[PDB]
Write an enzyme that holds these catalytic residues in place. Structure first.
Site, PDB file in Angstrom:
ATOM      1  N   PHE A  15       3.309   9.767   0.772  1.00 61.79           N
ATOM      2  CA  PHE A  15       4.235   9.659  -0.354  1.00 61.79           C
ATOM      3  C   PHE A  15       4.919   8.296  -0.355  1.00 61.79           C
ATOM      4  O   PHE A  15       4.974   7.624   0.677  1.00 61.79           O
ATOM      5  CB  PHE A  15       5.260  10.806  -0.349  1.00 61.79           C
ATOM      6  CG  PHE A  15       6.223  10.773   0.809  1.00 61.79           C
ATOM      7  CD1 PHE A  15       5.896  11.375   2.021  1.00 61.79           C
ATOM      8  CD2 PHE A  15       7.470  10.164   0.677  1.00 61.79           C
ATOM      9  CE1 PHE A  15       6.788  11.354   3.092  1.00 61.79           C
ATOM     10  CE2 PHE A  15       8.369  10.137   1.742  1.00 61.79           C
ATOM     11  CZ  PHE A  15       8.028  10.734   2.950  1.00 61.79           C
TER      12      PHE A  15
ATOM     13  N   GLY B 229       0.813  -1.211   0.000  1.00 59.92           N
ATOM     14  CA  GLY B 229       0.000   0.000   0.000  1.00 59.92           C
ATOM     15  C   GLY B 229       0.845   1.259   0.000  1.00 59.92           C
ATOM     16  O   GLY B 229       2.074   1.196   0.111  1.00 59.92           O
TER      17      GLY B 229
ATOM     18  N   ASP C 263       0.766  13.439  12.183  1.00 60.25           N
ATOM     19  CA  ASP C 263      -0.122  12.654  11.324  1.00 60.25           C
ATOM     20  C   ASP C 263      -0.672  11.437  12.068  1.00 60.25           C
ATOM     21  O   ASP C 263      -0.806  10.350  11.501  1.00 60.25           O
ATOM     22  CB  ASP C 263       0.617  12.232  10.047  1.00 60.25           C
ATOM     23  CG  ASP C 263      -0.322  11.870   8.909  1.00 60.25           C
ATOM     24  OD1 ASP C 263      -1.519  12.227   8.961  1.00 60.25           O
ATOM     25  OD2 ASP C 263       0.152  11.228   7.949  1.00 60.25           O
TER      26      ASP C 263
ATOM     27  N   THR D  65       5.729   4.220  -1.843  1.00 63.12           N
ATOM     28  CA  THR D  65       4.971   2.973  -1.899  1.00 63.12           C
ATOM     29  C   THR D  65       5.696   1.908  -1.079  1.00 63.12           C
ATOM     30  O   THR D  65       6.922   1.807  -1.134  1.00 63.12           O
ATOM     31  CB  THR D  65       4.806   2.484  -3.355  1.00 63.12           C
ATOM     32  OG1 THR D  65       4.325   3.559  -4.173  1.00 63.12           O
ATOM     33  CG2 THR D  65       3.826   1.316  -3.437  1.00 63.12           C
ATOM     34  N   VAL D  66       4.934   1.116  -0.327  1.00 67.96           N
ATOM     35  CA  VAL D  66       5.514   0.113   0.564  1.00 67.96           C
ATOM     36  C   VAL D  66       5.346  -1.310   0.020  1.00 67.96           C
ATOM     37  O   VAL D  66       4.250  -1.713  -0.377  1.00 67.96           O
ATOM     38  CB  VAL D  66       4.960   0.248   2.014  1.00 67.96           C
ATOM     39  CG1 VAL D  66       5.430  -0.899   2.903  1.00 67.96           C
ATOM     40  CG2 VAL D  66       5.379   1.588   2.617  1.00 67.96           C
TER      41      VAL D  66
ATOM     42  N   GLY E  16       1.218   5.387   1.527  1.00 66.22           N
ATOM     43  CA  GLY E  16       0.848   6.463   2.442  1.00 66.22           C
ATOM     44  C   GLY E  16       0.799   7.797   1.719  1.00 66.22           C
ATOM     45  O   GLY E  16       0.445   7.856   0.537  1.00 66.22           O
TER      46      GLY E  16
HETATM   47  C1  LIG Z   1      -2.841  -6.481   5.928  1.00 59.21           C
HETATM   48  O1  LIG Z   1      -2.186  -5.711   4.913  1.00 59.21           O
HETATM   49  C2  LIG Z   1      -1.037  -5.139   5.396  1.00 59.21           C
HETATM   50  C3  LIG Z   1      -0.111  -5.876   6.127  1.00 59.21           C
HETATM   51  C4  LIG Z   1       1.047  -5.274   6.592  1.00 59.21           C
HETATM   52  C5  LIG Z   1       1.314  -3.931   6.335  1.00 59.21           C
HETATM   53  N1  LIG Z   1       2.520  -3.417   6.856  1.00 59.21           N
HETATM   54  C6  LIG Z   1       3.054  -2.135   6.738  1.00 59.21           C
HETATM   55  N2  LIG Z   1       2.547  -1.225   5.919  1.00 59.21           N
HETATM   56  C7  LIG Z   1       3.061   0.002   5.813  1.00 59.21           C
HETATM   57  N3  LIG Z   1       2.510   0.914   4.941  1.00 59.21           N
HETATM   58  C8  LIG Z   1       2.792   2.349   5.108  1.00 59.21           C
HETATM   59  C9  LIG Z   1       2.058   2.951   3.885  1.00 59.21           C
HETATM   60  C10 LIG Z   1       0.874   1.971   3.620  1.00 59.21           C
HETATM   61  N4  LIG Z   1      -0.388   2.611   3.991  1.00 59.21           N
HETATM   62  C11 LIG Z   1      -1.578   2.151   3.553  1.00 59.21           C
HETATM   63  O2  LIG Z   1      -1.649   1.177   2.825  1.00 59.21           O
HETATM   64  C12 LIG Z   1      -2.808   2.863   3.956  1.00 59.21           C
HETATM   65  C13 LIG Z   1      -3.880   2.174   4.537  1.00 59.21           C
HETATM   66  C14 LIG Z   1      -5.020   2.867   4.895  1.00 59.21           C
HETATM   67  C15 LIG Z   1      -5.106   4.249   4.678  1.00 59.21           C
HETATM   68  C16 LIG Z   1      -6.331   4.988   5.062  1.00 59.21           C
HETATM   69  O3  LIG Z   1      -7.368   4.329   5.607  1.00 59.21           O
HETATM   70  O4  LIG Z   1      -6.408   6.188   4.882  1.00 59.21           O
HETATM   71  C17 LIG Z   1      -4.032   4.934   4.096  1.00 59.21           C
HETATM   72  C18 LIG Z   1      -2.893   4.246   3.736  1.00 59.21           C
HETATM   73  C19 LIG Z   1       1.135   0.725   4.492  1.00 59.21           C
HETATM   74  N5  LIG Z   1       4.123   0.378   6.507  1.00 59.21           N
HETATM   75  C20 LIG Z   1       4.686  -0.459   7.335  1.00 59.21           C
HETATM   76  S1  LIG Z   1       6.069  -0.341   8.425  1.00 59.21           S
HETATM   77  C21 LIG Z   1       5.929  -2.014   9.047  1.00 59.21           C
HETATM   78  N6  LIG Z   1       4.896  -2.509   8.414  1.00 59.21           N
HETATM   79  C22 LIG Z   1       4.200  -1.780   7.519  1.00 59.21           C
HETATM   80  C23 LIG Z   1       0.390  -3.189   5.589  1.00 59.21           C
HETATM   81  C24 LIG Z   1      -0.783  -3.793   5.114  1.00 59.21           C
HETATM   82  O5  LIG Z   1      -1.725  -3.116   4.388  1.00 59.21           O
HETATM   83  C25 LIG Z   1      -1.161  -1.993   3.708  1.00 59.21           C
END
Ligand SMILES: COc1ccc(Nc2nc(N3CC[C@H](NC(=O)c4ccc(C(=O)O)cc4)C3)nc3scnc23)cc1OC
Length: 267
Positions: free
Chosen positions: A20, A16, A126, A22-23, A18
């Site tokens: 800025f 996903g 944030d 992509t992860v 955030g």
């Molecule tokens: C279960 O799926 C997962 C398992 C592990 C992870 N793990 C992790 N994801 C993320 N990102 C940081 C940037 C990404 N943001 C969104 O995807 C997002 C989600 C929701 C909203 C909204 O509601 O506004 C905005 C942004 C996710 N960072 C780190 S640091 C250690 N683990 C993770 C993520 C999963 O999902 C992304």
């Protein structure tokens, strides 16, 4: 702090994005063990990632996501320890069965991490349920330090799209960000958690939220949310910065109530 690209293996799929970058999920060869990692991949964007990395390097707490390091390869990369269950809001949306006691446990953990951040004189800027990541169903960590600031030695605030629905009135009116403004955000986060990941101020524009709060109005109590926890939310939404509690006071309230609920469970 500088990692070796050939020791990093990245997945094809994306987890996903955030504000800025992509992860992606990855694997990093450590001194002996291999570590599962979450990797943020990408002139302004480069500096933003490095500033985020700079903040994370200085933080050391069980309830904050740890940075493994950085690497300049295909693009700049920020390598972090993996939180397998992901964002708190998304998890609760998919798991409505999660007990009230469990929610209190998780938000208390967030309050402990924020108590530390406050002590360390960093403002998150944030803080929202999307930026709390779950290691397990019973272990939350604060993430996404892209907007975070190290406070000057002589000031208790930082002077600055914004996540308006999470912002304290002084952020909107005076562009001032403090640990107290993080407390306001934490109140919104609590509301989100007890609402099982529902968005706050449903159907409202940012300007309408600002108008609502100026009138002294606040979001209602979520279904099934204990009165003591709603009371704490409202306290976090104290208009006056000085009268608003700090994270020491917030953590203590959550700690004590959590123990009360643990006690009731044993009875
Ligand atoms: C279960 O799926 C997962 C398992 C592990 C992870 N793990 C992790 N994801 C993320 N990102 C940081 C940037 C990404 N943001 C969104 O995807 C997002 C989600 C929701 C909203 C909204 O509601 O506004 C905005 C942004 C996710 N960072 C780190 S640091 C250690 N683990 C993770 C993520 C999963 O999902 C992304």
């Amino acid at each position: 702090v500088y990692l070796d690209r050939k020791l990093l293996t990245l997945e094809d799929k994306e987890l996903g994005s955030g504000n800025f970058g992509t992860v992606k999920k990855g694997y990093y060869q450590m001194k002996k063990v291999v570590k599962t990692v979450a990797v943020k991949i990408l002139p302004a964007l480069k500096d933003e990632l490095l500033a985020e990395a700079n903040v994370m390097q200085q933080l050391d707490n069980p309830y904050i996501v740890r940075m493994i390091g950085i690497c300049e390869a295909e693009s700049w990369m920020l390598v972090m320890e993996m939180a397998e269950l992901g964002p708190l809001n998304k998890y609760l949306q998919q798991n409505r069965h999660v007990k009230d006691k469990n929610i209190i446990e998780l938000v208390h953990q967030v309050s402990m991490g924020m108590k530390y951040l406050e002590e360390s004189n960093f403002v998150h800027r944030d803080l929202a349920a999307r930026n709390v990541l779950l290691v397990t169903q019973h272990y939350a960590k604060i993430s996404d330090f892209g907007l975070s600031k190290a406070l000057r030695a002589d000031e208790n605030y930082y002077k600055a799209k914004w996540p308006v629905k999470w912002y304290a009135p002084e952020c909107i009116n005076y562009y001032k960000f403090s640990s107290k403004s993080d407390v306001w955000s934490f109140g919104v986060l609590m509301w989100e958690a007890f609402s099982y990941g529902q968005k706050p101020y449903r159907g409202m524009k940012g300007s309408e939220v600002t108008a609502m709060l100026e009138k002294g109005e606040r979001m209602g109590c979520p279904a099934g949310c204990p009165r003591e926890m709603y009371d704490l939310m409202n306290l976090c939404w104290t208009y006056d910065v000085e009268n608003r509690p700090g994270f020491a006071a917030v953590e203590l309230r959550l700690r004590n109530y959590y123990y009360d609920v643990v006690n009731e469970g044993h009875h």
